[PDB]
Amino acid sequence: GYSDRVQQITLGNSTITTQEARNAIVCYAEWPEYLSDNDASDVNKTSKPDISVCRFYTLDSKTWKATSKGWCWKLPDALKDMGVFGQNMFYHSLGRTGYTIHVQCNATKFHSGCLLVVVIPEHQLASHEGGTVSVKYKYTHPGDRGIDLDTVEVAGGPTSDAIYNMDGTLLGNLLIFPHQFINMRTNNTATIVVPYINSVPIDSMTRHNNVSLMVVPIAPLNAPTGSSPTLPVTVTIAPMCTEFTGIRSRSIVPQ
Amino acid sequence: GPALSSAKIILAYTPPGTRGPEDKKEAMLGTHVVWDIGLQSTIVMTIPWTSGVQFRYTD
Amino acid sequence: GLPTTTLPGSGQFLTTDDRQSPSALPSYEPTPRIHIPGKVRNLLEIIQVGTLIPMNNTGTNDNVTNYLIPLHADRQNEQIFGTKLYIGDGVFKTTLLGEIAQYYTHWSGSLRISLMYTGPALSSAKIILAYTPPGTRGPEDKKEAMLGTHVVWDIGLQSTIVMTIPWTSGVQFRYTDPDTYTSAGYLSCWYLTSLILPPQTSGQVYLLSFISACPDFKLRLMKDTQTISQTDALTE
Amino acid sequence: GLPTTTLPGSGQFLTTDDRQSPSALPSYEPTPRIHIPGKVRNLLEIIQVGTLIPMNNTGTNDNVTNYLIPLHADRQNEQIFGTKLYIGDGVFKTTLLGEIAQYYTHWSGSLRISLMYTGPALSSAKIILAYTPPGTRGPEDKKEAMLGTHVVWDIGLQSTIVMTIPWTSGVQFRYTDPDTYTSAGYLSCWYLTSLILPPQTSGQVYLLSFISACPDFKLRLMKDTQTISQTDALTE
Amino acid sequence: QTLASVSSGPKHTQSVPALTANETGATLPTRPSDNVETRTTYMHFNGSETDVESFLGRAACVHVTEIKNKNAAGLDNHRKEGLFNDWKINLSSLVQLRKKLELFTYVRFDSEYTILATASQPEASSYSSNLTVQAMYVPPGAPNPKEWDDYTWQSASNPSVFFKVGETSRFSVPFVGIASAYNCFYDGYSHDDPDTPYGITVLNHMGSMAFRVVNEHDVHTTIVKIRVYHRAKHVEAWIPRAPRALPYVSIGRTNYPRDSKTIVKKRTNIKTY
Amino acid sequence: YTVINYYKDAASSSSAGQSFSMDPSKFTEPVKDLMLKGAPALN
Amino acid sequence: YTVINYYKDAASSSSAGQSFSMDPSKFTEPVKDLMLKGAPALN
Amino acid sequence: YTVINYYKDAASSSSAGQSFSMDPSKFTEPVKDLMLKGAPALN
Ligand SMILES: [Ca+2]
């Protein structure tokens, strides 16, 4: 009697439900797990706050307009002010984690539009200027707000080119990364489970973003006649298997 | 509401110790359930016994 | 003092040979490997993944609308799109398959084309996807088209239709670079019935098309691509 | 007359290769080995020995006072010393560890810092030694400092305190040459209470600090040092 | 024998493999026998040439530089005069190989370096000089050459090769990364500072190579050009990405030209063949 | 064919063989719930 | 890997292997009476 | 005489041996009905 469409995800003291899912992607066919001794370098003991950080945090909502270009969030950056997770993220020299990303967008059997929801490991952004100019720290560290692609470009910030994935590659090939679609006629949500992917066992959570969640309208939003021309897009994210180390005084970052 | 409508609601329980949430951001930091409106007409959220002392007064 | 004779080619540097050489860092210990998800062993592994085809090639500048195939309501018997099957050129050149195919000289195998419907749930349609083997001209109408490999698509819950283009060829390998003798035929789309939209709905609906290779696929004779070049060496 | 083909690199002289060569003195008999205490097999053997750190870097000319850390009586909450953890530079550059570390490119491992008290026997004190992992600024006060790896030292019969700096790092190897991404954090010292001198005693008391590597240690990619050079060849 | 295709006949089932849901993010392995009546055929193929070992296993030019051999008397800047040169080993200056490497996110391998040195005497000279080049591997932290005949060329601990112009030098180098793999991309910074660079990491450092002619000077000047080729051996690659579409403009940066707007070829009609 | 290593270091050796452990699934079907070709993609 | 000596004299041979008999003690604990980490250095 | 292949690819090897499976018949007597030397070519 059960369906691939109705699902529940319980993580800590938060439970999410969807009645219009389209399965879910488990990046590179790998589920998150803690760091093993064989892989460990750092001799320190890791802190595992569990259910206090491994729960769902909901980001500030977005508004899908018929002219929308897309949005980009960088992790662990987007969750740096989220309760005890953000705290831990700034008291330790190193951390490690995976996530459960849940993107939401409900509509009407009269609407049509399609979103591409993708997770890109190491999304090194291109600068507005080009040349040898780098994208300033604060521009890749927007926090919860993320990068709104239809915002005017500034000096030292990224390009606002969805067509070029903000990195010099083409949009259509973004399908090589773990992704999922939100096709209104079908979908309601998109869920992606992300394991820890990095060339080092553990890392600094502030000077390096391991991934950037990208939500990009492909098929323009087309609402029924007399209906409101927009739809909100909500992103809920839960850290899973989080570990922290190198505890000390509060990390000091720019701003 | 009609069958041809849609919505996503968030129900939250804020344990004792603070003020009532003032916004969804504050609210979601506690026990909560994200509700997806569909065929299944009702959502059920349990408020787990979250307390220091083992009994509370009804008054 | 073992007598030898050196052969032609002695001292040449063939970029493609594979021999032993002394290590400049003797006794050096490389960092231990750690587990990293997403290991790629063969390129044939990744071309099996479908990526979008910029079929709406119309325009002057690249734009997200190149990936959107327009569909019109209440049109009957009409043609939706057409294209040659040159995977190293045209619409397929920028795709992941065409991108990797261009690092090789020969190709062989079956292709996978999926068409995903994005129109309202309360709409309906029946489309016809066709593959015309080499030997003739691209179909000029649905009648001509349906005489070849085709799939009738019924739009519904199942959002995507998948059609495989079976290896239809005399010679066992075709060139990736567009060559006449080794052409793969045509691909076209038409309305079997027509798109029907519900009340309070209007405008265009779009189709998303994906391309990937079947397990059938093979690619040989590695070479340099035409998809990247430079006039000067880069610097920091 | 065995046919061969010579390869690229033939005739090159790579200072780092290891092959056989004819002996210019064939049939020669080397002097017999006699027993000699103090055989060194690996450099990792000797960096485990602690040597003094010239922490009192203040001055213009090298002088025995560079190894002496000043301590003041009846001072409370104050800072005794601070330094970055750049073993290939700063205060550690001349030490035996830093001296040998500079013959290699990468380093990894835990460090040992001992502080030996030389003040009168009839004095007392409680000091706090701290290691601040990378990611922030050097502590500005004892409160900030104690939030990291630290040791509270009680001065007594046991003259020295030993604190190990556990390998606290994401990447498995750091560069010996000061590089930002591969920095090791800070090291600082403060009074947990204060130094108390007995009657008929006055002036400054000093601390001697030693640095050595733990068995944890590793050093790779051998290279030339910056701690020695010359403008002309030497003669007798 | 592995089967490329099996014999398959007519259908009329409830099992519809032609229909799926790309919303899921998956690509199901359909075969032509799912939509066509087929015949049995054999692969007669293993896929050797597409193994990443193959793909990155051939030498590619990664750098071209130049040095000279004049009379260094009175010359105050040997480097500018071209008596010796450097090269901060990087594999993203020449684009042919860079696009190949970047097909993946993290990459681990051993390097096989082949160095070619050819000579030219553009102006009036009685004969062609037979020169010897020294190539020194200068790890970060080792002292840098300042003059063409410094104490640095003593190279007591730095590996160096001596070879003749016209000849070639070949040696292998172990994976020298401080991490478990090389980063083709790195969405990070060295430290959390507002002005530090982005992308470029010591996590990609492979070193710097110094070059010079060991011989003194003749009456004429001789110009030596050095070409460095790199071959990857014992390859390991993780996380495939989208191919590069736009031109490259800088080393270690994903930056692309802002006036480049038409990478996809255009038609006029979506219906034409 | 035959090959013996003439050098001490592993880096010195020639090219590694063919992996023969291809598995496009991690990239083509990284779905949580298994989908079977022929059955409803979504039920 | 393989190696056969082509010359008569022992000097002609290549580099000797890794000692694997490290012992920092002769340098780090050349004390007469044994000291045990954890117990009073001086009693 | 002896030969060992020094290369991985089959193309790299030297010349193939003598076929020793000559059969001029496919060219000299491709007749349907067998003709026997000595008997009437046509009866
Ligand atoms: Ca002459």
From Swiss-Prot, chain E:
Transmembrane segments: none annotated. It comes from the Viruses. It is found in: Virion; Host cytoplasm. Interacts with capsid protein VP0, and capsid protein VP3 to form heterotrimeric protomers. Five protomers subsequently associate to form pentamers which serve as building blocks for the capsid. Interacts with capsid protein VP2, capsid protein VP3 and capsid protein VP4 following cleavage of capsid protein VP0. Forms an icosahedral capsid of pseudo T=3 symmetry with capsid proteins VP2 and VP3. The capsid is 300 Angstroms in diameter, composed of 60 copies of each capsid protein and enclosing the viral positive strand RNA genome. Capsid protein VP1 mainly forms the vertices of the capsid. Capsid protein VP1 interacts with host cell receptor to provide virion attachment to target host cells. This attachment induces virion internalization. Tyrosine kinases are probably involved in the entry process. After binding to its receptor, the capsid undergoes conformational changes. This is Capsid protein VP1. It comes from Human rhinovirus 3. The chain holds residues 583 to 855 of 2178 of the full protein.
